[PDB]
Ligand binder design. Structure first.
Ligand code: K
Ligand code: K
Lengths: 510, 510
């Protein structure tokens, strides 16, 4: 009997690209493909040189640049093979532009029933329209499950690409098409929610069982043998930090994992003491996610642990808009079948703990998005709060919050006190651009020193760690402020308590 | 041992008025008190005559008219006793006007963080602000649980008023202050979620236990004896229609009740065959509610059955706005401790059935409100759909819906094909008025004949009843089209199937 090697990664791929939340729902896919992914490809076909030149200065990583510039011929063939896809998806892009731009501004406060009469065939039956607060300006929302039911959500445009992992750091993956760039890699068509991937990550297969598996993925010849080679012979009360904003926990034998992202292992030259896919218990009872940003809920990680998961807790949103579509339903298309959505300050009991959802402000470019929460976990008398990227930009909200929830022992706050422009993530979903100087004042930032101070001062914790920092090398898949972190470590220590910025790993007494 | 008499009603009262959803959350209370309830009282103090004159023509019921005009002195004293309340609530009304009118339009697409700096003390920490789709127009939402935590939600402004019920029909109750107009009535201060009301509706008390109970409500002397007199000595597979849009169901011993409203009994001169508080099983396993309109979820009914209820299913909304605030949280303040919010086309298993939530369009004045769903219930091979007031104003939505949910046997649709102006309910929550002729085209209507036809034609049911009609006399508490109903009864019958409009009661084979 055999199992996947710790040093093979199985990378999520949707419509040619490294896979994440907003590529799943056809209506957001379409805004990205049209307004970003085609622009990146065409720009590259025209001058491979810019991209190479760009890729070479480390400091230009994260821009709209293809990292496998050597492979011009393959990329061109791929673009052209997929033209009927990019074209059926543009049919949706046009419907939506048509409704936001030609149909909705026609109306000024009267009955809207005349609109369902005029909807593009793409949207017919799949949207609801209404006025906003002024009663005169018309808006809309998608009926999400009907979208997924439509021909525009297509499971066949999904894939996984197996490849070896030889070191800690990761190259920035979001702007480069997912293809077989080397014989070590294996690109395979399967839907992301498939139970075949579950077979894989679970393992314990005989050699003939692997052949069967591999034949159900439609593999044979050398591909089937590459596939086979990715497999090797099958070999309390804790609070473990493990990377970026990901924290593991056992409490009277119930397991918790917050904002999942994990590194790999099985290769020379690692970093001592990492917490890896290999360090995981049998079952993950409760998976918690603070928001919808890749650094907090990485598809690659999630697909891998899916088979071990009990319940997923996530914050409730019903906007069913482009900028902000239902987290919970995304998780369901990924194959998670027990997902619970929690409103502000609702309380769920979890094994022997109690989990409370907390209000979470900012980090989203002052955009209309409801998928954010922090979590407070009460393990009997000790009680820990995970705040992720949430910033304290509303003076008293924390006082009022404390009045309802009682005292808190331990706090994790994230101080990416300056990060990206919000258009960097959300930009292709907008309707038209903002004028540059405005767009510029709309950032994704974590709490800085003063804000962070006032969080601490209003919750009176005895322990106070700062995470979500983006230090660990493997976060490079997807992505001054230290001055501030340190200001805070001293503040909290000077006031008679433990504090510490986190990097790489840490056991902690629970 | 004793129990409440079937012929005593226990009427919900918030801040002086017959109690319902939008009076619960302080932010909506405040819009109603200021923009409607004060206007009604003052107008009456000035000329009791208009009101009497108005009350006397039946056809003017439902307008802004006080029904107990004889009792001028009492009403005046009540108004003046409660001035410090109406004044602390105006402090919130002003905060909100201030933020919608002075603060939010100042901003044009830049960072909003400067706003939490300027928030009225009333809202400090209790709101979140953001841009809408155009990215330039600022909007907001309340953090609902912090509102309820605030001094503006005040349980002490809540009450119940016991009174006898001597006949089927009910006088229109929403526009007249809840006071003791007669020695038969008993007005009592207790919070609506109180477990003391549960004691009452449960009953089985000894006479000394009633005295104890009555002493915990702070009663004695003649009041305690009136209270006591409201008590008398303690005395399969069904599908029961029972009134308006309320339908009961047993299936392999699990009980369901949809859109609850019930009549009373124990008085001469009733209507034979009513389904009453007395006809109810021991336990209500699953309570379903399609939307947030009083005709579909009457506080009076709900408070009475609270103690017998298992789970409440309700549609999910996160708008946490004025026009549309969280149904689920309202139910929690009323004392329901197991409430589940269901998104479009999510499926919950319920005892031996499966309940699916269905998209629901219209009936809400093209306003931004997410609290609406129909329910499909699968009892094994028979499968029944409750559509309430939802109108088929989107051509294909029903085709697409059917494609996902499979075939349906039985259908209840509501054909109040013309009803009220939407400002009649929602009017006091708006920011300013619409110009009259516009407001006029924004109605709350059920499906008419053609729309209804196309629902039937796309679901192919064998049975098809029309409800939500507002026939039953007791609906008068809170509230041409028959031509259309009948058109539909014939249509469905001519195409080889059962059809029928419902009135008063009906057993049905399940
Ligand atoms: K599909
Ligand atoms: K309160």
């Amino acid at each position: 009997r055999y199992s996947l090697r710790q040093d093979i990664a199985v990378e999520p791929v949707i419509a040619g690209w490294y896979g994440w939340s907003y590529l799943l729902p056809p209506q957001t896919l379409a805004r990205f493909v049209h307004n970003r992914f085609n622009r990146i490809v065409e720009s590259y076909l025209d001058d491979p040189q810019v991209h190479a030149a760009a890729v070479r200065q480390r400091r230009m990583h994260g821009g709209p640049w293809i990292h496998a510039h050597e492979h011009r011929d393959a990329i061109e063939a791929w673009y052209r093979e997929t033209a009927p896809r990019r074209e059926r998806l543009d049919e949706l892009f046009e419907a939506v532009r048509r409704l936001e731009e030609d149909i909705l501004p026609r109306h000024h406060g009267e009955c809207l029933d005349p609109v369902y009469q005029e909807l593009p065939a793409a949207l017919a039956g799949r949207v609801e329209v209404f006025y906003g607060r002024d009663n005169r300006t018309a808006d809309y929302r998608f009926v999400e499950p009907l979208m997924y039911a439509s021909e525009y959500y297509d499971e066949s445009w999904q894939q996984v690409r197996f490849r070896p992992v030889t070191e800690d750091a990761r190259e920035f993956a979001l702007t480069t098409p997912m293809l077989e760039y080397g014989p070590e890699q294996l690109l395979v068509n399967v839907p992301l929610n498939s139970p075949l991937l579950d077979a894989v990550f679970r393992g314990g297969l005989t050699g003939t069982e692997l052949d069967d598996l591999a034949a159900r993925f439609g593999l044979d010849g050398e591909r089937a043998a590459r596939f086979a080679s990715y497999f090797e012979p099958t070999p309390e009360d804790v609070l473990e930090y493990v990377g970026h904003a990901c924290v593991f926990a056992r409490h009277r034998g119930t397991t918790f994992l917050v904002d999942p992202v994990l590194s790999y292992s099985g290769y020379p030259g690692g970093a001592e003491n990492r917490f890896t896919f290999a360090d995981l218990p049998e079952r993950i009872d409760h998976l918690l996610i603070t928001h919808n940003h890749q650094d907090h809920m990485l598809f690659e990680t999630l697909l891998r642990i899916r088979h071990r998961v009990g319940r997923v807790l996530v914050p409730k949103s019903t906007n069913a808009s482009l900028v902000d579509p239902g987290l919970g339903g995304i998780l369901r298309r990924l194959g998670f079948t027990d997902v619970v959505e929690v409103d502000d300050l609702e309380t769920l009991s979890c094994g022997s703990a109690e989990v409370v959802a907390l209000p979470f402000l900012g980090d989203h470019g002052d955009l209309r998005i409801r998928s954010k929460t922090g979590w407070l976990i009460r393990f009997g008398e000790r009680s820990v709060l995970f705040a992720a990227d949430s910033t304290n930009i509303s003076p008293t909200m924390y006082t009022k919050v404390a009045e309802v929830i009682g005292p808190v022992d331990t706090v994790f706050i994230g101080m990416e006190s300056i990060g990206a422009a919000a258009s960097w993530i959300y930009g292709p979903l907008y309707g038209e651009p903002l004028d540059r100087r405005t767009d510029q004042s709309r950032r994704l930032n974590g709490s800085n020193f003063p804000q962070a101070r006032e969080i601490v001062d209003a919750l009176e914790p005895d322990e106070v760690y700062v995470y979500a920092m983006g230090l660990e090398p493997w976060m490079g898949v997807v992505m001054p402020a230290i001055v501030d972190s340190d200001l805070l470590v001293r503040h909290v220590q000077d006031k008679g308590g433990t504090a510490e910025r986190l990097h790489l790993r840490r056991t902690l007494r629970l």
